[model samples]
Target chain A: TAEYKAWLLGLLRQHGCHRVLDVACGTGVDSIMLVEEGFSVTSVDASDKMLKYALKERWNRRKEPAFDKWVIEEANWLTLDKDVPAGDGFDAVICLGNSFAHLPDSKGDQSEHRLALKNIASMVRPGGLLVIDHKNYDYILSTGCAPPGKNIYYKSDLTKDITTSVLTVNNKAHMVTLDYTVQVPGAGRDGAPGFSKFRLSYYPHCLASFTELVQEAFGGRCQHSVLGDFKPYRPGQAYVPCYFIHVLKKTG
Target chain B: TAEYKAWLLGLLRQHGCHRVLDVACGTGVDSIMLVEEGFSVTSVDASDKMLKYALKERWNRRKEPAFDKWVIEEANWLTLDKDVPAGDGFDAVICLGNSFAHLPDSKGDQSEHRLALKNIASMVRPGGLLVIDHKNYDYILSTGCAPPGKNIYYKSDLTKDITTSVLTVNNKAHMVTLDYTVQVPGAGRDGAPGFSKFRLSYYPHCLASFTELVQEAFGGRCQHSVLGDFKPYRPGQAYVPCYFIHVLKKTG
Candidate 1:
């Protein structure tokens, strides 16, 4: 929603963050929003395909004075600044797209985002901020159903007359994966050829767990905002659908 | 060659290396070799498929005094000692089939085994040894081909005129992957609705680089024999056709 965009940009501006670091810049969605909000954004992502497409969209954007320059590069937050130089002291760092959850657990341990969240702290200047958006896992877990977190692109298109929504969404508390299936018309009463086509992967994360990851990464140096505090909403008190946006500011 | 297994078994015995650890114990090949050589072995792999198959082979072996008890468990050496206890030092830790290269470099940072190699070293006890065999990348990088290393199941299934060795092998110095394809005439070519296929991914490591990793992981506390200094051959001194074996021992 445009309001969600406004709420995020407002948080950055309120904290006086300018030179923004945008991670998981999937197809430049939030990256574009950050730039248009009058911020000089440095956007990075692990996926070369997504980065390539995002850059393509950036170049193909309509000219507007509100939109500022954004330096987009390919990088993984877990092992940031190793290959591509993720310069230190950004005014703010942003990781959305629920991508924080995708950091492949080193030998099946995700309880701590020691490498990734620490790297994020390194990116933000002292007194600078980090804004991350993720699914409201509290809602998902308590309710035992991930309330189709509003994702525009990931509504994900499929075949004609199939109208595919996620057929099965699993939340294992530790991780989540989606299975989308399309049951095609069958010519098999006597068994000709009929099968349901499916796609097998999607990354997962929860607000409470990721918040702990944030605390684990920055320790006492950064002040935290439990997700969805941008609006007149207090996290866990008011039920906010879709994403839970968390803001972290490192103290000088 | 049968002599290859004998050489490895001989190395273990010469060092008086008894308890053995096999990382990437694919199909229990080397693990079985370790046990049959009279060493108690702890074999592990990241793949359940590989571990199960290896355990099955452990159960399905022919009766002989050459074999002994082995413990096959699932594990990744990168994050050592979590899933299955790697315990304290073993007499030797074995990583054959050039499996060290597949320690799962998440991003594009592959020049150094940097992190995973360190974990492998941790698996070994003080005064213990580590033995590894890899597709000789030093020779492969100089020549644009991977020398065929011994793999019984990978030299694998055969039929009349239907042999499938690695079809294409790519070398990046630090790593390599082989594409083993059959490319037989199929039903598409005839009744050739022919498309029954298979794939297995393998990684390559060089003698000098992997030696450096061993040393980096152990520092001055361990002494390493470059690749092969076995009685009749030394690196660059003679044309060794297959993989060169390296041994590292942590001194007391």
Candidate 2:
């Protein structure tokens, strides 16, 4: 999530989009950054507990005037138009990182990609922009490689350090998968060392393919660019020299 | 040793060589097979214990008078001229598996390839053939990639169940290396479980390159073939196609 927010802010700044809406904004890091930049911002997330934590954090850092500009909403982006003002829109709408990759499949026709394109298109005025960042399947398939494994250590304020190992594997389909295992050396809150494993998967997409899908659903004037080092976009490339980024302009 | 003996006997029969020398022939597996095929054989090994075991096995199977014609020499192949009888040159000398790859580096020069070539060339008679087999470095380097992690498991022999897991790392380097950490989860002679870790390294080489190295050292008739499936030498093609076999005959 931290990586996602960083990439989004870097690309938005490069393309000159100021006002922003961050959907499914867990923890509100991107929203906080946009508000700090003096841009009008709205952060929406489905989890009430997450929004509560974000509000509590805003109070904890109340000295910063940027916290006042963020309008936190505890609502689902999928059902927002039915509940709130439909005409309210922003200069840019974003679904960054792999959050879109995890949309729950429904009735064998979730079509989250198409649905996301349709919804974000409606949220932006004609000629306004929508930006999405995702994993690059073309790069992964062409290279036929996997990412290096990393080991991280985390410590609680009152407890001993916990060690975690992260490993990545690629399937025949070119999907990137992650396996994380954590071990606590000493007794935990329940007086026993604990071990846990978490697994996640991300399906990568080509830049041109993704742009065409969004353009077909949103009926937008589209311009695609591959991001390099997450700093800016480069034209004529399907993937960023460093990662991947795509930009679309809404057209009626 | 069993597989090596089977492969050698098949090759000797195909080439119509009647006299064979098993250099570094620990326990004389190949020597026994050659005698059974009506070929006069000489077996040499450096270890006294290995030579004793080979002689005992030969006596146990000496019911056939033809077996008594074979000779066993307790001497190192590296110092063969000092121990082997004069004028006892062989039509073909065989060094199977990684025996050559394991030659001790007394001078800190890792080029065992050069030393083995020099020693073997001196042992073979004029027009006699030499066959040396080692691990296939090229195939391992091309397809071997690993991810980083540790796995621990146990095995029970009575049940014939072998439990194991692999730890791999994905990264690029000039050399490929790996560490295997294994534990035999049963009581030892002293009634304690044992654990051990060992590291292995591989360097890839082409068949033409290895053949060139042998030719440069021996300066004899040189020909190379890719031995497929360890089958008898044939006109063309194979089943397993694993190692590159370099067959050289003395000309000077």
Candidate 3:
């Protein structure tokens, strides 16, 4: 937990980010963490169900009413500007947890994803930052399997013993279905330990194609870097990461 | 033919149009016609096959080489700006013969079409115009059949006696395949008249959806109107035309 926050704060502070917009703020964890770290945040998610849980968490952590000024709203990537006005725009707009991949439709036409990237970048002021992360689809697609390393960026903290695996990988469709299981105690019938499972479908975005899109979206006005497992990624490194972080600063 | 040219010339004259960019210049017919009308013209087509025929026609009509200033190039809607530089942009950009429908892929995702519209519009200077046409999908999709009126905008002038019919209609996919037959005199075996048949596919854009996309692409900074069979379209008119033309004038 400390390491994740330290790494994130390093990037934000490096970019002089103060006000942040979390576009894929699911369950309010990251938003709450940012609020505690003394950053103004506008947290939004496309799903109402996710926002419901996020609000519940916000209320649970509301020791002082005024400290809970964090805004939690329902807005997708495309509608972010309309639903939440960026008067002067945010210092940084982030979409983590591979949420950007959902913008593409089932047919896998990436025009929507490209448009979403454009819309998200618009929410950040000039010289501000736009950060997004996704599973290392480049590795997955190339190797025809998930990375052997553990998934460090899954962002679920409900269980002590958690495990994840790639349930299915469709190279032709550019899709992956992940299987996640978490052990819970005293929640099953007769108060025994039980396991909760989740299967998620993602249309994986290849790192090369995504970088191309980002460049086109920003029109070469931005400089970008890639992070593997939250560390600077060097091509042909021995260790393969399960996820990638793309940090783009609007240079113009 | 006289009425079509008159109607088009009237719109172009009203807009003070001169130089024209034809994104879907097929067989060089419209481009040649525009050149004959004394308008500075750049003709482009995505298909090299089509361009070959266009060049053939140009050569056939090349009695005076100095008169052929038509810039015949090969470029699609998306590649227009990149392939052909729009120096200060053109006075008008036009895509006729229902060629705009080909921008949408087989999946019928409108984002590509939307992006193409944006690209095409970008090549037109402020106060200039963009003209595109498609079959009246509103009538075809609503009635689940080909329009009873003849297909006036087919743009094939090869034969005097020609007939057309909708061979297949896939509403779910927003697809239409049209079959055409033209009688050729003394072209068959034993010097008899032969029937030449051709089938073409289109991802038809509904009048309402295309209008919305055009408006969004221009950011509502343009005024637009619809033309049915080359005349101002009237809603619920007794005579239903086979095609609808979208005329967008960039106001800003």
Tell me the whole-model lDDT of each prediction, alpha carbons only: 0.63, 0.58, 0.73
lDDT of 3 at B152: 65
Q: Write one digit per residue (lDDT tens) for candidate 3, span A44-155.
A: 9989988889888778776755338888999887666687788888898888777886665544467777777887888878897878888777776555455332648645
- Residue-by-residue lDDT tens digits, candidate 1, B78-112: 56756656565677888776677556444546533
| DockQ-sorted candidate list, best first | 2, 1, 3
Q: Per-residue CA lDDT of candidate 2, range B202-223, in tens?
A: 3334355566666766764544
Misplaced by over 4 Å in model 2 are A1-18, A47-52, A62-65, A75-80, A83-85, A104-110, A142-175, A182-195, A231-242, B1-252
Which ranking of candidates, highest lDDT first? 3, 1, 2
True-structure Cα RMSD, model 3: 24.2
Candidate 3 lDDT, B1-252, residue by residue in tens: 667777777788777898998888888777777788788888889999887788886777777552367778898777767988888988998888878886646444676777788888888898988888887777665454453235464455466432222222111334455555557887889888887777665676777778888877778888888887787788888778677888888888
Native contact fraction per model = 0.00, 0.02, 0.00
Off by over 4 Å in 3: A1-252, B63-66, B147-171, B181-191, B194-196
Return the top candidate by lDDT. 3
